[PDB]
Swiss-Prot record, chain A:
NCBIfam families in UniProt: rplM_bact
Gene Ontology molecular function: mRNA binding; structural constituent of ribosome
Gene Ontology biological process: negative regulation of translation; translation
InterPro entries reported in the protein's UniProt record: Ribosomal_uL13 (IPR005822), Ribosomal_uL13_bac-type (IPR005823), Ribosomal_uL13_CS (IPR023563), Ribosomal_uL13_sf (IPR036899)
Matches recorded under HAMAP family: Ribosomal_uL13
Protein name per UniProt: Large ribosomal subunit protein uL13
Subunit structure: Part of the 50S ribosomal subunit. Binds to Obg (AC P20964).
Swiss-Prot/TrEMBL keywords: Ribonucleoprotein, Ribosomal protein
Curated annotation (Swiss-Prot), chain B:
HAMAP family per record: Ribosomal_bL21 (MF_01363)
Quaternary data: Part of the 50S ribosomal subunit. Contacts protein L20.
InterPro entries in UniProt: bL21-like, bL21-like_sf, Ribosomal_bL21, Ribosomal_bL21_CS
Family listed: Belongs to the bacterial ribosomal protein bL21 family.
UniProt function note: This protein binds to 23S rRNA in the presence of protein L20.
Gene Ontology biological process terms in this record: translation
Keyword Ribosomal protein carried by entry: yes
PROSITE patterns (UniProt xref): RIBOSOMAL_L21
Gene designation per UniProt: rplU
Protein name: Large ribosomal subunit protein bL21
Domain of life: Bacteria
One Pfam family hit: Ribosomal_L21p
Any single Gene Ontology cellular-component annotation: ribonucleoprotein complex
PANTHER family the UniProt entry points to: 50S RIBOSOMAL PROTEIN L21 (PTHR21349), LARGE RIBOSOMAL SUBUNIT PROTEIN BL21M (PTHR21349:SF0)
Organism: Bacillus subtilis (strain 168)
Curated annotation (Swiss-Prot), chain C:
Gene3D superfamilies: Ribosomal protein L22/L17
Gene encoding the protein: rplV
PROSITE patterns according to UniProt: RIBOSOMAL_L22
Cellular component terms (Gene Ontology): cytosolic large ribosomal subunit
A biological-process GO annotation: translation
A Pfam family this chain is assigned to: Ribosomal_L22
Family assignment from sequence similarity: Belongs to the universal ribosomal protein uL22 family.
One annotated GO molecular function: rRNA binding
Protein name: Large ribosomal subunit protein uL22
Function: This protein binds specifically to 23S rRNA; its binding is stimulated by other ribosomal proteins, e.g. L4, L17, and L20. It is important during the early stages of 50S assembly. It makes multiple contacts with different domains of the 23S rRNA in the assembled 50S subunit and ribosome.
Keywords: Ribonucleoprotein, Ribosomal protein, RNA-binding, rRNA-binding
Quaternary structure, from the entry: Part of the 50S ribosomal subunit.
UniProtKB/Swiss-Prot annotation, chain E:
Protein's UniProt name: Large ribosomal subunit protein uL15
Stated role: Binds to the 23S rRNA.
Gene name linked to the record: rplO
UniProt keyword annotations, A-Z: Ribonucleoprotein, Ribosomal protein, RNA-binding, rRNA-binding
Species name: Bacillus subtilis (strain 168)
Quaternary context: Part of the 50S ribosomal subunit.
Residues of the full protein shown: 1 to 49 of 146
Disordered: region residues: 1-49
Length: 143, 102, 112, 117, 49
RNA sequence: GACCGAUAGUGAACCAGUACCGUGAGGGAAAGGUGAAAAGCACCCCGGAAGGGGAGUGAAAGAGAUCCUGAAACCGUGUGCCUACAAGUAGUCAGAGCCCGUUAACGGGUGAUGGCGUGCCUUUUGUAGAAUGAACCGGCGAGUUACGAUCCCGUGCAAGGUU
RNA sequence: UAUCCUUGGGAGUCAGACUGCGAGUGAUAAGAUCCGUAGUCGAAAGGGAAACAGCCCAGACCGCCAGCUAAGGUCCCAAAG
RNA sequence: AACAGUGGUAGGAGAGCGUUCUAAGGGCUGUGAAGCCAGACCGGAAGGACUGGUGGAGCGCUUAGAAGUGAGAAUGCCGGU
């Protein structure tokens, strides 16, 4: 035999969760968030095809990675810009353009190619220290 | 009654009215097999957690033997010229529960 | 009910001819004939005339009506590349072709 | 007597192209290219057949791990209390039931507390 | 005896012919093959000669 | 004739030593089929002209003048499913939606996207390759037979067998 | 005990390759060049080392949505304190 | 029954399947043979046959023996594209 039960249906409906980001590290926190963005927070079919769930950071202007850890953070991209390989750090993302640290740190924890970039869309970064996403009923949750 | 039983090396969830695809057994047609290896009860019952419970005993009505359709397996070895093929099909049984006796 | 048609002995490539055939589909005979007649090429009045004559016959003998008919479908399919000599240089013996086509057309009544 | 071996050729050749169903491109429309895909198909088949069973395991472990966090324990000490109690392991497959049925989830949590780190 | 039961008793049913039509079902792929650098030749295709 | 059956076989199955090639000695092809019988398209319509388009023919007109059976490549036509933020030597395996409806296993159709990934034959230890050949599909074609020799194994006699 | 012994009938093979262990060559460097040992590969998939037949895991004719180790992990994705 | 299993190249050893033909015991056919094309064809380990449509005049299972005997690639061969 090879008959099998499932539990994908129950736990996937594109529900909405918020997760704090105000004064938070958003590094060690983000890891636990990524789990839930892929669909996994209870028994779920999730290493393979399934739509994710919405999980939203509430802030983006109080992201401090704390101590020396901050300064020597790594980020990369390889674009069609004449410099190719651009490399940046959390420290200089904090010194203007503070939105980008939270984006590339949660994209990185969801890649699968096509399906990976779908799950990414369900993230909204914001920066007011509040959500206007109360229209979709969010609630605080972590793994 | 809720139950889970052993089907050799694997387990299957089983209630008091459902068919289930199981491994091959000699039995077919209208025969009767029992699964007193019922090793979890839990849906309206409570178990924790010696192997087997005596508060339940799933009973099955053997309902025909069917087969899993043939599926060609093959290994080619290029420039070594081996081409050994095999096919798995084989008989299997299906049984229908309809009563989990206490 | 339906009228067939075919053209023989013309100069036009299959690839080329497919275009006009599929484009006259769903359109009345009265329109389709006019198109072909004033399409440029020397094969035009030839493929026109044969198609037109298929219509004519259809009325008198098989009880159909020209005005009512449309074009169910039509197409042109790859056939032999017809070698008819034209010089190709470098001392080489080769022909630039003058292909022919197998024109399929199915006219039919839309109103009986 | 003799035999051409030539009636046989259309039988052998035609079969390969007619066993290719749901295949893509022009690789199942051309004979000599279809051959090469039969070799692919068989090699791939056997490797993935066994690989997949590990992937279902690397799926079930995840399900349990998620449920486990919401009991105040984690997967290590959960599975430990299951196995050490005896049964209440319930494979890993069927322990997806901890979302679906509350009654089940309670028992797997009671079993967890029994033996812990 | 009978013409519908010609049945040799191994006076012509001793048989067994080594394969070469097979590509590697039995032994070998074609005549003149081994593993040496002199294979796939008419002359030198033999080991023993 | 325990010979061959239409790309197989004579160079040549047929108006072939023709066609075609060399000043010359001489080299050298492709090509079968409407029926049992022509009854080979009366009757009609249109076009400059080639042809067809209906109808009849006759057991059979996918038997209608490349007309037997008529595939595959090639080129189209209808329809079911499927996709406009996506990464690929092309499949494999998993789920999932929608569609359809098995003779029997009680059944068939697709790809939305996940996991995973070295062309066939060479040449070698090993080519997935930028050393080889092959545009593609179909046909055609090589492990053949005899006679000595040595084992096998089936038989006859049995110290004799053998022309 | 697919351990040894003996005879008869068919072999194929002289181009192996790479790694660990130990000696020689070298400009004392170079899957460099020579080999004793063991191993894998050749002549078996497959596991690990991000991307590698040869080290490390193991010898899988074939199916299982079963469990146990090795190598390798447990914060997440490409599974797990 | 129980015990044990190792199924891969050069080769050794063991069985079988398809294709044409001759043989003697047998059987279909114009009320539709051989062949053409599809099919979720029951039954194979693999090489492998039982159904419907078309087709339009001859066909073959067993038991045995035979061979240009299963392709494709040869700067292979002929035709179509």
């Amino acid at each position: 035999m090879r008959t099998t039960p499932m539990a994908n249906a129950s736990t996937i409906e594109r529900k909405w969760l918020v997760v704090d980001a105000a004064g938070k590290t958003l590094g060690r926190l983000s890891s636990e968030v990524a789990a839930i963005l892929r669909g996994k927070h209870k028994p779920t079919y999730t290493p393979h095809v399934d739509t994710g769930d919405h999980v939203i950071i509430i802030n983006a202007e109080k992201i401090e990675l704390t101590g020396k850890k901050l300064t020597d953070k790594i980020y990369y991209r390889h674009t069609q810009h004449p410099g190719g390989l651009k490399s940046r750090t959390a420290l200089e993302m904090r010194t203007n353009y503070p939105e980008k640290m939270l984006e590339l740190a949660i994209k990185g924890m969801l890649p699968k190619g096509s399906l990976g970039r779908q799950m990414f869309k369900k993230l909204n970064v914001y920066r007011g220290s509040e959500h206007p996403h109360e229209a979709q009923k969010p609630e605080v949750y972590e793994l | 009654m809720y139950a889970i039983i052993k089907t050799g090396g694997k387990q299957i969830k089983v209630e008091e009215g459902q068919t289930v695809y199981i491994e091959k057994l000699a039995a077919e047609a209208g025969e009767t097999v029992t699964f007193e290896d019922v090793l979890f009860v839990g849906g309206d019952n409570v178990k924790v957690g010696n192997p087997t419970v005596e508060g339940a005993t799933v009973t099955a009505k053997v309902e025909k033997q069917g087969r899993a359709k043939k599926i060609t397996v093959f290994r080619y070895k290029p420039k070594k010229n081996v081409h050994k093929k095999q096919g798995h099909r084989q008989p299997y049984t299906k049984v229908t529960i309809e009563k989990i006796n206490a | 009910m339906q009228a067939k048609a075919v053209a023989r002995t013309v100069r036009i490539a299959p690839r080329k001819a497919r275009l006009v055939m599929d484009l006259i589909r769903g359109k009345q005979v009265g329109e389709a004939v006019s198109i072909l007649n004033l399409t440029p090429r020397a094969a035009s009045p030839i493929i026109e005339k044969v198609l037109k004559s298929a219509i004519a016959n259809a009325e008198h003998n098989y009880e159909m009506d020209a005005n009512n008919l449309v074009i169910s479908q039509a197409f042109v399919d790859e056939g032999p590349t017809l070698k008819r000599f034209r010089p190709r240089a470098m001392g080489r013996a080769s022909q630039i072709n003058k292909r022919t086509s197998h024109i399929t057309i199915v006219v039919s009544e839309k109103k009986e | 007597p003799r035999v051409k071996g030539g009636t046989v050729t259309r039988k052998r050749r035609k079969k390969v192209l007619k066993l290719a169903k749901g295949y893509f491109g022009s690789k199942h429309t051309l004979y000599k290219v279809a051959n090469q895909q039969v070799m692919k198909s068989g090699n791939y088949a056997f490797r993935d057949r066994r690989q997949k069973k590990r992937d279902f395991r690397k799926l079930w472990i995840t399900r349990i791990n998620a449920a486990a966090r919401m009991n105040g324990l984690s997967y290590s000490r959960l599975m430990h209390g299951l196995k050490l109690s005896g049964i209440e392991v319930n494979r890993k497959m069927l322990a997806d039931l901890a979302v679906n049925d509350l009654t089940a989830f309670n028992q797997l949590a009671d079993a967890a507390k029994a033996q812990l780190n | 005896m009978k013409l519908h039961e010609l049945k040799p008793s191994e006076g012509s049913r001793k048989t067994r012919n080594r394969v070469g039509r097979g590509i590697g079902s039995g032994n070998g792929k074609t005549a003149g093959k081994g593993h040496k650098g002199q294979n796939a030749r008419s002359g030198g295709g033999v080991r023993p000669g």
